[PDB]
Amino acid sequence: GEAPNQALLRILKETEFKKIKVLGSGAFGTVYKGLWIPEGEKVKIPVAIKELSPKANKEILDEAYVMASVDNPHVCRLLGICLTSTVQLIMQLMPFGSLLDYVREHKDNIGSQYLLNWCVQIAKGMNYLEDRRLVHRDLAARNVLVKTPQHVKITDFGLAKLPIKWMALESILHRIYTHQSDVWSYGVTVWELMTFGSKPYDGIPASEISSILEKGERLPQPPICTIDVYMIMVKCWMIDADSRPKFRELIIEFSKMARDPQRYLVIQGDERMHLPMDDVVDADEYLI
Ligand SMILES: CCC(=O)N1CCC[C@H](n2c(=O)c(-c3cccc(F)c3Cl)c(C)c3cnc(Nc4ccc(N5CCN(C)CC5)c(C)c4)nc32)C1
């Protein structure tokens, strides 16, 4: 069969971390901004802690199973798990929150250089998930988190294995999901970034959309987009998925553009923008 999955999963102590503040509250549970101090290691990792029945307990353990199996620069790191009355999941802290909210928050101060690098960074993240035989199944701007304005990570693949508007057509008709089903949602996620956070197909019922794509309609060319960038989103939205590009290729193309950013994204006032307890280390450095 496949190769053995020798991911190590780490059990952490409740005494070993302390929760500063609440990041969010939902039906899943509550997520805390926090710090994690391994016993006698002189390090303080900034973490996000998720805390929340029997079916639910299961859900979080399978999440953990997934996150432990993938560890990478470009996918959020899972530090570990804690076995408590309520099981707690300990992840790397992404200080600036979701790319979707960042991109709406600073639309006026985001240059073309930052955009194209995000497109590259995310493609690299999916190329890794491709290499790991992992189909994300829910790629979207809400599920990218910002470590620094210069570094973004894919996170929240609850649905990952091995949201109609982001889904590939085949996924809508047949509930089929492939890597090429993720390339499509990649295109939608880029379209999200280039329109600076716009809702795709806003004002449209979900039940029409399947027919829309069968007719041949797609999302429009965002203003700031050269036909070079846009031509690429459109290639992700082919009906035949063997004709959509490979994440490896999107890495190469977007990378090319990144070298001459203002040739591919025309943003008004582009070149005039910029973007923003001793023991603390980032989780990316802590692991090795
Ligand atoms: C669309 C994202 C999203 O809204 N939310 C809900 C709340 C946090 C959640 N959140 C995780 O769910 C997860 C996660 C994903 C999958 C499994 C798992 F166990 C976890 Cl822990 C991680 C790793 C995570 C890491 N960093 C962070 N920083 C972070 C979030 C929100 C903010 N805000 C919200 C309100 N503020 C008052 C101002 C701005 C800020 C500044 C930072 N948030 C993380 C996801």
UniProtKB/Swiss-Prot annotation:
Tissue/organ expression: Ubiquitously expressed. Isoform 2 is also expressed in ovarian cancers.
UniProt subcellular location: Cell membrane; Endoplasmic reticulum membrane; Golgi apparatus membrane; Nucleus membrane
Main location: membrane
Glycyl lysine isopeptide (Lys-Gly) (interchain with G-Cter in ubiquitin) crosslink, residue number(s): 21, 42, 55, 58, 215, 246, 256
Catalytic residue list: 138
Site (Important for interaction with PIK3C2B): residue numbering on this chain: 286
Phosphotyrosine: residues bearing it: 286
Superkingdom of source: Eukaryota
Sites of N6-(2-hydroxyisobutyryl)lysine modification: 50
Mutation effect (residue 39 to K): Found in a lung cancer sample
GO molecular function term, any single one: double-stranded DNA binding
Consequence of changing residue 70 to M: Found in a lung cancer sample
Binding-site list for ATP: 23-31, 50, 91-92, 156
Mutagenesis / variant outcome for changing residue 52 to F: Found in a lung cancer sample
Family: Belongs to the protein kinase superfamily. Tyr protein kinase family. EGF receptor subfamily.
Assembly and binders: Binding of the ligand triggers homo- and/or heterodimerization of the receptor triggering its autophosphorylation. Heterodimer with ERBB2. Forms a complex with CCDC88A/GIV (via SH2-like regions) and GNAI3 which leads to enhanced EGFR signaling and triggering of cell migration; binding to CCDC88A requires autophosphorylation of the EGFR C-terminal region, and ligand stimulation is required for recruitment of GNAI3 to the complex. Interacts with ERRFI1; inhibits dimerization of the kinase domain and autophosphorylation. Part of a complex with ERBB2 and either PIK3C2A or PIK3C2B.
Name used for this protein in its record: Epidermal growth factor receptor
Organism: Homo sapiens (Human)
